[PDB]
Write a protein that binds this ligand. Structure first.
Ligand SMILES: *[C@@H]1O[C@H](CO[C@@H]2O[C@@H](C)[C@@H](O)[C@@H](O)[C@@H]2O)[C@@H](O[C@@H]2O[C@H](CO)[C@@H](O)[C@H](O)[C@H]2NC(C)=O)[C@H](O)[C@H]1NC(C)=O
Length: 218
């Protein structure tokens, strides 16, 4: 809608807090019958009712966790801002939230914010010592654990290796782990060659560079 003002997407650290803005642009004279926030699955999260007052009907999104960012509404105008604050974000607070204003007698208007919960992963790379030999094996590995969304691992290498990585879910629901094994058939002129594991993830401004010096044996 035009009459309702929201952010198309919002981002908050897992366990952290977010504000979902919402306002009724056209500063008209028409009363706000009520305001309500619904997830797209149809779960009403928070609402200000006509004469009843402010409400938070679902168990999972209790009053202890959600609240309207502007809580002392004098007169209708005071209603034009339905900005909602989440504290203690869980993965399940993820969603497409619809901010809807009911106006009298018809009809209602509404905006949609995508609420995304982000989890910063833990990353590390180590070298695997290997003996020279005809089969390719993993000479180096990098692990990006507990990231949301999944991190992206690439490698910077002067050797002619294939990085083949695999994904498992992390210990935390919502989060995923990437294990990247860099393989090339261990030659000898690998030894001491600095190779970088590069992890990209939303929670970092720039890719993370993890240096590794390769070993080879005998
Ligand atoms: C949250 O919504 C965004 C935006 O998408 C709109 O409404 C959705 C319900 C759906 O109908 C989309 O087609 C609409 O664009 C979603 O972002 C899209 O995600 C889809 C997978 O459903 C993906 O293929 C598209 O590339 C995304 N669209 C755009 C324009 O980037 C997102 O998936 C929704 N998230 C959740 C958890 O529901």
């Amino acid at each position: 809608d035009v009459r309702v003002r929201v952010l198309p997407e919002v981002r908050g650290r897992l366990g952290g807090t977010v504000e979902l803005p919402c306002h009724l642009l056209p500063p008209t004279t028409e009363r706000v019958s009520q305001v309500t926030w619904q997830r797209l699955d149809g779960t009403v999260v928070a609402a200000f009712h006509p004469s009843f007052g402010v409400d938070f009907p679902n168990s999972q999104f209790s009053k202890d966790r959600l609240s309207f960012v502007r809580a002392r509404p004098e007169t209708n105008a005071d209603l034009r801002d339905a900005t909602l604050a989440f504290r203690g974000l869980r993965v399940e607070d993820e969603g497409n939230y619809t901010c809807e204003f009911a106006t009298d007698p018809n009809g209602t208007r509404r905006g949609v914010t995508w609420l995304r919960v982000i989890a910063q992963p833990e990353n590390h790379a180590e070298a695997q010592e290997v003996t020279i030999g005809p089969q390719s094996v993993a000479v180096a590995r990098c692990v990006s654990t507990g990231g949301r969304p999944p991190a992206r691992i690439t490698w910077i290498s002067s050797l002619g290796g294939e990085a083949k990585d695999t994904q498992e879910p992390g210990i935390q629901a919502g989060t995923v782990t990437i294990i990247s094994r860099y393989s090339l058939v261990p030659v000898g002129r690998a030894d001491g060659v600095k190779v970088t594991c590069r992890v990209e993830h939303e929670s970092f401004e720039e890719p993370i560079l993890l240096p590794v010096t390769l070993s080879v044996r005998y």
